[PDB]
Amino acid sequence: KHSSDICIVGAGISGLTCASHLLDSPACRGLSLRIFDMQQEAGGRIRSKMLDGKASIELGAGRYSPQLHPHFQSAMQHYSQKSEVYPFTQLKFKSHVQQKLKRAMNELSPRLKEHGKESFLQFVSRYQGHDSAVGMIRSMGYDALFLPDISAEMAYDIVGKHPEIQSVTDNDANQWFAAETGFAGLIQGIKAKVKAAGARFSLGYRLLSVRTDGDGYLLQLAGDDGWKLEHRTRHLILAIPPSAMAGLNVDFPEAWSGARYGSLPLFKGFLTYGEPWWLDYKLDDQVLIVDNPLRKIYFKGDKYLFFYTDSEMANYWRGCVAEGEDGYLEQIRTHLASALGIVRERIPQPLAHVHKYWAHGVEFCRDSDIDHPSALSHRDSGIIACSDAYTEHCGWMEGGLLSAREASRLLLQRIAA
Amino acid sequence: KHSSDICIVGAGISGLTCASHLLDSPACRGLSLRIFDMQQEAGGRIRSKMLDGKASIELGAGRYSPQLHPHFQSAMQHYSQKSEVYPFTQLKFKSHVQQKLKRAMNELSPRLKEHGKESFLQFVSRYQGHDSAVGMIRSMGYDALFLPDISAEMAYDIVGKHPEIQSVTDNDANQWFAAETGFAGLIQGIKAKVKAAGARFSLGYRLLSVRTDGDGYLLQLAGDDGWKLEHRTRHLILAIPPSAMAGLNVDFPEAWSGARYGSLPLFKGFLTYGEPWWLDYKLDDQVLIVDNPLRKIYFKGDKYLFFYTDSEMANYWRGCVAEGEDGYLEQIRTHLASALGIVRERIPQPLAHVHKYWAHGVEFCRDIDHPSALSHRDSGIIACSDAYTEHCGWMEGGLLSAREASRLLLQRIAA
Numbered sequence A: 001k002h003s004s005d006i007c008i009v010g011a012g013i014s015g016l017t018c019a020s021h022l023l024d025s026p027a028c029r030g031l032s033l034r035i036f037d038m039q040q041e042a043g044g045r046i047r048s049k050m051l052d053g054k055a056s057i058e059l060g061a062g063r064y065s066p067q068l069h070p071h072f073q074s075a076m077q078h079y080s081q082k083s084e085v086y087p088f089t090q091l092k093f094k095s096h097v098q099q100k101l102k103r104a105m106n107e108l109s110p111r112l113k114e115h116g117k118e119s120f121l122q123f124v125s126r127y128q129g130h131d132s133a134v135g136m137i138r139s140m141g142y143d144a145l146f147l148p149d150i151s152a153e154m155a156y157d158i159v160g161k162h163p164e165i166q167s168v169t170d171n172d173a174n175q176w177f178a179a180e181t182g183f184a185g186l187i188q189g190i191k192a193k194v195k196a197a198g199a200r201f202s203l204g205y206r207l208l209s210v211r212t213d214g215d216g217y218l219l220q221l222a223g224d225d226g227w228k229l230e231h232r233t234r235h236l237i238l239a240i241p242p243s244a245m246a247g248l249n250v251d252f253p254e255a256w257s258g259a260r261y262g263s264l265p266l267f268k269g270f271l272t273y274g275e276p277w278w279l280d281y282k283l284d285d286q287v288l289i290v291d292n293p294l295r296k297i298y299f300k301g302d303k304y305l306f307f308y309t310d311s312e313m314a315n316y317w318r319g320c321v322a323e324g325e326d327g328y329l330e331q332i333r334t335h336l337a338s339a340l341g342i343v344r345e346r347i348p349q350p351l352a353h354v355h356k357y358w359a360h361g362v363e364f365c366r367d368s369d370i371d372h373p374s375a376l377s378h379r380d381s382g383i384i385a386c387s388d389a390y391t392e393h394c395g396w397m398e399g400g401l402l403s404a405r406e407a408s409r410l411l412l413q414r415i416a417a
Numbered sequence B: 001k002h003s004s005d006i007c008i009v010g011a012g013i014s015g016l017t018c019a020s021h022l023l024d025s026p027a028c029r030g031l032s033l034r035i036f037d038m039q040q041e042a043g044g045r046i047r048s049k050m051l052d053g054k055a056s057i058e059l060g061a062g063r064y065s066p067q068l069h070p071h072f073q074s075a076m077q078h079y080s081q082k083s084e085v086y087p088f089t090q091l092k093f094k095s096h097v098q099q100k101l102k103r104a105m106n107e108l109s110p111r112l113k114e115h116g117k118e119s120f121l122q123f124v125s126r127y128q129g130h131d132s133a134v135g136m137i138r139s140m141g142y143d144a145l146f147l148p149d150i151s152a153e154m155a156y157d158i159v160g161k162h163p164e165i166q167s168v169t170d171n172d173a174n175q176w177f178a179a180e181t182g183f184a185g186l187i188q189g190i191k192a193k194v195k196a197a198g199a200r201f202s203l204g205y206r207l208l209s210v211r212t213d214g215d216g217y218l219l220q221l222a223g224d225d226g227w228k229l230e231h232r233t234r235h236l237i238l239a240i241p242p243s244a245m246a247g248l249n250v251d252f253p254e255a256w257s258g259a260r261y262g263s264l265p266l267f268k269g270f271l272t273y274g275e276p277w278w279l280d281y282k283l284d285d286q287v288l289i290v291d292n293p294l295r296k297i298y299f300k301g302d303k304y305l306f307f308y309t310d311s312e313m314a315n316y317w318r319g320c321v322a323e324g325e326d327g328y329l330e331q332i333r334t335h336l337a338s339a340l341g342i343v344r345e346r347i348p349q350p351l352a353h354v355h356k357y358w359a360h361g362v363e364f365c366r367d368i369d370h371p372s373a374l375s376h377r378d379s380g381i382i383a384c385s386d387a388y389t390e391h392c393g394w395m396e397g398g399l400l401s402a403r404e405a406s407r408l409l410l411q412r413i414a415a
């Protein structure tokens, strides 16, 4: 009827890579593959848009590194997606604290054996006081570094893996790339190749409950026009992040692993101008990291600028945008002036602008060394979970590519046995 | 967030017209007004696309009559919206059964005084065979007429108010019009007036709960990107349909009125082609009502064709799409061939195609001592909808209900 052998819920890069693997193995010749996604287009947190029509921007995932993301780089190669160089790898304008930051971290490196499981701010508060730790951490631009569930070990890692601040650790030799046409180009390639292998896509449907009926599973979905729908399937991968797994009858996270999980919100806003005015200030391809709310300001060539924030500072912008769009634009203009040491009259007004708020932008495992495998399995019901958070690269596309490969392994095992 | 004096939840023609009647008023001078809608664009069940860059199509409301719907044509003239003759007012290619229509319907009409509360299929199967009543009703193309909820008296009014079949009950006097640019032109016109007069819009936000708090109310809303949000207002209109009303925590329909409410699903599917092939059949600006699942088939000049079903048939099609767009387009093209009396291989395949399904397309009145807008027994929230009027299911109903709810809300402002 309305049934399938294998069903993947989730059409981000995790899901579509689980689809890509299964299709090639001849363990799946003549088997039926259905992919469901709650949105109307695949990608998940990869989301490329044409702004004004003149340029290509990344509302979600933006950059990758061949050092840290070789499986992603191989993917971009395999689908003939052309990469470009990502300029935002040094701060031209290192302030006094950003100066001190570099040395100030090679030196507490030892004490991470002793107290490295403290919070990152608890940790640094011992070098100088609370008030110097904050100035140091603020100066790095990523507010998540102030959370309590961010260990001081997790923190030395995060800054080593971000292009704008990597120079502060011994990860300063990592190259970074973005997509020419945008990562959605990769997503389309995988989609198209999975489609021609005969997987069937039902985009715009959202899973609500799962129950076992004997040899298989029985899914309750609700389309986005209200249409309820049910689907009998023999094998199921839930290619969706932990935050999404919480909202079902699958007893998550208890039936799946020992871990608890968390997430942070992220906010990006982009602005386009008539004239590229930041060229006078020699600013194309530069990143300021500031103490004001924009926190990280980027000038892409002569094309546009954008900023990028997280945690409390992402909620703050999602609040401001809710209070109407003209006060949001006027706060941006104010803070662009502070970062450039000028007065707001010399900042034009924009033509166009877009913004994106991700409630659960990065999801991450809260327990280090609890022995976390790439994909999870429901101990009772035998469902496979698959997400970047279940990996060493929580919060990276690479973590999706690796959870998917494991997740497609444990599936095939369930078939051939 | 912050607050507002007046809050309207809903940006269809009801809510947008409420906003209009209020900002027109001198009693609202100075007062702040906030509008919320869960969709990103205003309109509700008015949606106009412009598909294949060559024509404006209507995925919801598509026609009005100056005779049946006077306020709507006033609103059309009021906002300087051009109209055009709606072509589909008769059947050029009737079958055998749909001339027995006018002569059996206008002959079974004296019997309506004795069996008025009876459902329509019970009725017309008393004065003809059952399989002869199933052939006669289904010849009219609206599958809502096979339902116990809809009575034999409430059925003669649907037949005379719809332009494809109104000939069947002496009402060809009525004329039918569509918008030249589609009805979103109206919706944009009102919207610009209400924005120019200082109301602040918040689209993409969806109301989940209300709670009173003295002189005013506190509303829980959720953005479509997850962003939860809290808003306090002093006066509040819920300009949403009753299906939406039941989805909240506000004792509906109990604390509001002694009426029940149902709904019917609707489905429309549009198809555009490289060459306008149906001309070779003299089918342009024509409509065929057919037995097969397409039910009502429309040919817009030489630009596109579409088909329009309701009730179960609407659910037939929604299910078909759900099992893949390929099963659906080949289904359409099979039934298209059976309707024209030709082979499948002569129906070309379409370039572009769009469709919409309305889980609650029409919301109607279960009853008749009925006011045009509801008030809460206790809290004073006002509900506004086409479903509370003599015109259950027309844009006209939303205009009438809007007027009513403005006046109740102004009475609650003054005095």
Ligand SMILES: Cc1cc2nc3c(=O)[nH]c(=O)nc-3n(C[C@H](O)[C@H](O)[C@H](O)COP(=O)(O)OP(=O)(O)OC[C@H]3O[C@@H](n4cnc5c(N)ncnc54)[C@H](O)[C@@H]3O)c2cc1C
Residues within 6 Å of the ligand: A009, A010, A011, A012, A013, A014, A015, A036, A037, A038, A039, A042, A043, A044, A045, A046, A059, A060, A061, A062, A063, A064, A205, A206, A207, A208, A239, A240, A241, A244, A266, A267, A268, A358, A360, A361, A362, A386, A387, A388, A389, A395, A396, A397, A398, A400
């Ligand atoms: C602002 C931002 C910037 C980023 N920058 C980078 C970067 O530069 N480099 C990098 O490597 N990573 C980056 N990431 C992270 C990267 O985007 C993700 O890790 C990767 O896209 C996740 O792949 P995924 O398939 O596991 O998750 P997702 O993309 O979240 O896929 C989830 C999919 O499942 C669907 N879905 C969910 N739930 C349900 C349900 N209950 N029923 C049905 N369907 C459902 C969703 O619609 C979604 O399509 C960034 C993320 C954000 C938010």
Ligand SMILES: Cc1cc2nc3c(=O)[nH]c(=O)nc-3n(C[C@H](O)[C@H](O)[C@H](O)COP(=O)(O)OP(=O)(O)OC[C@H]3O[C@@H](n4cnc5c(N)ncnc54)[C@H](O)[C@@H]3O)c2cc1C
Residues within 6 Å of the ligand: B009, B010, B011, B012, B013, B014, B015, B036, B037, B038, B039, B042, B043, B044, B045, B046, B059, B060, B061, B062, B063, B064, B205, B206, B207, B208, B239, B240, B241, B244, B266, B267, B268, B358, B360, B361, B362, B384, B385, B386, B393, B394, B395, B396, B397, B398
């Ligand atoms: C297929 C179809 C064809 C039609 N053809 C015609 C025709 O030819 N002539 C005619 O007169 N009428 C026609 N109609 C009916 C016409 O569209 C409606 O009568 C009218 O548009 C409804 O107006 P409304 O403003 O009361 O509500 P709606 O148009 O339903 O708007 C309700 C609004 O409330 C919003 N909403 C709901 N719930 C919530 C919540 N919890 N939080 C926030 N926001 C919310 C919705 O987004 C929506 O914008 C047709 C309808 C359909 C479905």
Ligand SMILES: N[C@@H](Cc1c[nH]c2cc(F)ccc12)C(=O)O
Residues within 6 Å of the ligand: A062, A063, A142, A144, A145, A158, A162, A264, A310, A362, A394, A395, A396
């Ligand atoms: N890597 C993403 C964001 C990100 C990934 N992991 C984390 C962890 C964190 F604490 C903040 C942001 C992030 C980016 O910047 O493009």
Ligand SMILES: N[C@@H](Cc1c[nH]c2cc(F)ccc12)C(=O)O
Residues within 6 Å of the ligand: B142, B144, B145, B158, B161, B162, B264, B310, B362, B392, B393, B394
């Ligand atoms: N007949 C209208 C809408 C409508 C109003 N009431 C009803 C009842 C019904 F059974 C079908 C449609 C309708 C149309 O052209 O779409």
Ligand SMILES: [Mg+2]
Residues within 6 Å of the ligand: A009, A010, A011, A012, A013, A014, A015, A016, A044, A239, A240
């Ligand atoms: Mg996925």
Ligand SMILES: [Mg+2]
Residues within 6 Å of the ligand: B010, B011, B012, B013, B014, B015, B016, B044, B239, B240
């Ligand atoms: Mg409305």
